[PDB]
Amino acid sequence: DPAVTYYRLEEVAKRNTAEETWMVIHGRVYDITRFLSEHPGGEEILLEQAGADATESFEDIGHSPDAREMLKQYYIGDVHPNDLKP
Ligand code: HEM
């Protein structure tokens, strides 16, 4: 409500290369550009889903509670409600 920044999925889709990498997880946008080289699962698997909603893959992997906490550092905004799916 207050100072929440909103992005359309169309904007997120443009950040799909190693130069500026964004990813959507549970309706929120994360800029993981600087996390690529630090990801224990490697950088390739992240680049393969860059610029898109990676929620299913993130959950399917079974990430730990510590992995979820790491997300906060990369949070940059929410996906506009009109772009969220049923
Ligand atoms: C951008 C948010 C993400 C964060 C912060 C993150 C963080 C992490 C962390 C901390 C681990 C180590 C877990 C452990 O100690 O067991 C890990 C492992 C892994 N991550 Fe991610 N991850 C993210 C997204 C993804 C995505 C989108 C995929 C793609 C399917 C992925 C695939 C993996 C895989 C395959 C492993 C290895 C697990 C194993 O050892 O079997 N991650 N991730």
Curated annotation (Swiss-Prot):
The modification Phosphoserine is found at residue 64. One of its GO terms (biological process) is nitric oxide biosynthetic process. Residues 4-80 form the Cytochrome b5 heme-binding domain. Its main location: mitochondrion. GO terms for cellular component: intracellular membrane-bounded organelle; mitochondrial outer membrane; nitric-oxide synthase complex. The modification N6-acetyllysine is found at residue 14. Keywords: Acetylation, Electron transport, Heme, Iron, Membrane, Metal-binding, Mitochondrion, Mitochondrion outer membrane, Phosphoprotein, Transmembrane, Transmembrane helix, Transport. Heme binds at residues 39, 63. It is found in: Mitochondrion outer membrane. One of its GO terms (molecular function) is metal ion binding. It comes from the Eukaryota. Belongs to the cytochrome b5 family. Cytochrome b5 is a membrane-bound hemoprotein functioning as an electron carrier for several membrane-bound oxygenases. Component of a complex composed of cytochrome b5, NADH-cytochrome b5 reductase (CYB5R3) and MTARC2. This is Cytochrome b5 type B. It comes from Rattus norvegicus (Rat). The gene is Cyb5b.
